[PDB]
Amino acid sequence: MFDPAKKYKMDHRRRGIALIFNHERFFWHLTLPERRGTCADRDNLTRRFSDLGFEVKCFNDLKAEELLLKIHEVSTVSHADADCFVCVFLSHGEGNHIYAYDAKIEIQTLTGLFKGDKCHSLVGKPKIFIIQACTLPAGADFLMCYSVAEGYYSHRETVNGSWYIQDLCEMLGKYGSSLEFTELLTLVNRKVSQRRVDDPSAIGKKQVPCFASMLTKKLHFFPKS
Amino acid sequence: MFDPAKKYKMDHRRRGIALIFNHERFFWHLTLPERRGTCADRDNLTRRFSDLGFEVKCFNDLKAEELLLKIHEVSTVSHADADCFVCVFLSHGEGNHIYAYDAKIEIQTLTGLFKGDKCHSLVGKPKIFIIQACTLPAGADFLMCYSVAEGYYSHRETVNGSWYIQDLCEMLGKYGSSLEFTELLTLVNRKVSQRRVDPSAIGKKQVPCFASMLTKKLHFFPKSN
């Protein structure tokens, strides 16, 4: 009958793809912290998801030609022998209205490609989207992880990256292979929300992340094989 | 150090208020299964939250004068000796545009009254909103539970209530006092998504969702008598 401890099947051959998408186009004056922080976040993510068995692939949206080339690949490639799919969307904080509006269209596109109708090979498999906001995607077995609720405070980028990706990567490296994934995201909620400014204008305010789950089972990333 | 198993402090004198809000006004014609189903949902919820230690209150929005009265009561009353706050928002499925638009403002108002700035006595304590949709609430230590995604299928009310409330109450009764609450909501996601239809709803399934800004594990262990 009903098993409260039922888990997603994570014994397939591969873990799956971990797509790290960098939103760059329509962003012009890029300071030194932003440029070195974005690279720190990507590299930190590439190490934590690779250690969990994912095949990391990193795109950006600067070259429209290469963008469609590599997007078509991940959308049409078969995931039948994969445990799950992960997609991380990275963006800069201080962006214009064109940059911010493009991100929303990109996020809708990405999430839409992996819904049950357009990707049979991921049906019944967790589809995890981690979005660094500058939303309303939904679907069975989706997990949406947001760095901040839209309209609320998020700390500026730093040479070492952003608060959300730093804390998410610390928990992933420390607890990724043991704890249930939503328990892990709850720890990121606490770690990030506890950080404080040393920007005297941002005194007293905090960054509150959020995650929205449509998963039906427990999700673990025990070491494979 | 950092405790990955840290949980909210739930040893206060009282558990807290469990507000059951019935959205009724502007519904143009109420069929028999809808009258009883809504009553079945309210009674089922009152039984389960009472057994978990909550002080249950049930309002509706038929009397405009009496509602602002009671909304003022639950908002301004002290929660300093309470573990948390729960609010269930019940509404009918087949509603007109006025009925649906009114629901959004009611939900936006209700959640707003319990923000940290508006309610000092619930700061750092979980605030749980369970919404039977016909959204964008946020805040630290908020837990939003939706019967359905924003614009997807939801099964219609019956004499015994709605699929979402029935399955929620079944899990609360069996596992409410033991399992972490988000783990319990995940079981609801599976139970509701597995139910099939016996007309024009072939191949459809209702996929619930919950959005967490909680920072700790949430349990409802039996209170100290």
Residue numbers in the entry:
A (entry chain B): 30 to 163, 199 to 262, 266 to 292
B (entry chain A): 30 to 163, 199 to 262, 267 to 293
Give verbatim excerpts from the published study on this entry.
Caspases belong to a highly conserved family of cysteine proteases that have essential roles in programmed cell death, inflammation, differentiation, neuronal development and axon pruning. In addition to being activated by initiator and effector caspases, Casp6 can be activated by a unique intramolecular self-cleavage mechanism due to its longer intersubunit linker. Excess neuronal active Casp6 is associated with Alzheimer disease (AD) neuropathology and age-dependent cognitive impairment. By investigating the activity of four rare natural Casp6 variants (Casp6-A34E, Casp6-E35K, Casp6-A109T, and Casp6-T182S) and employing X-ray crystallography along with molecular modelling, we have identified a putative allosteric pocket on mature active Casp6.
Following our previous work, which described rare natural Casp6-R65W and Casp6-G66R variants with significantly impaired activity, we examined four additional missense rare variants with single amino acid substitutions located remotely from Casp6 active site: Casp6-A34E, Casp6-E35K, Casp6-A109T, and Casp6-T182S. Casp6-A34E, Casp6-A109T, and Casp6-T182S did not show significant changes in kinetic parameters, KM, and kcat, for Ac-VEID-AFC hydrolysis compared with Casp6-WT, whereas Casp6-E35K displayed slightly reduced kcat and consequently showed ~2-fold reduced catalytic efficiency kcat/KM. In Casp6-WT the E35 from the large subunit of one protomer forms a weak salt bridge with R254 from the small subunit of the other protomer (and vice versa), stabilising the dimeric Casp6 structure. In addition, E35K substitution disrupts a salt bridge between E35 from the large subunit and K284 from the small subunit of the same Casp6-WT protomer, possibly further destabilising a functional oligomeric state of Casp6. The crystal structure of apo Casp6-E35K did not reveal hints that could have elucidated a potential mechanism responsible for reduced Casp6 activity. Although E35K substitution may lead to the disruption of few intersubunit salt bridges within Casp6 dimer, we did not observe decreased in vitro stability of Casp6-E35K compared to Casp6-WT or dissociation of enzyme subunits during protein purification recently described for Caspase-9 mutant, which could provide an explanation for the enzyme inactivation. Located more than 30 Å away from either active site of the Casp6 dimer, the N-terminal loop E35 is found in the neighbourhood of K36, which together with E244 and H287 forms Zn2+-binding exosite next to the postulated allosteric pocket.
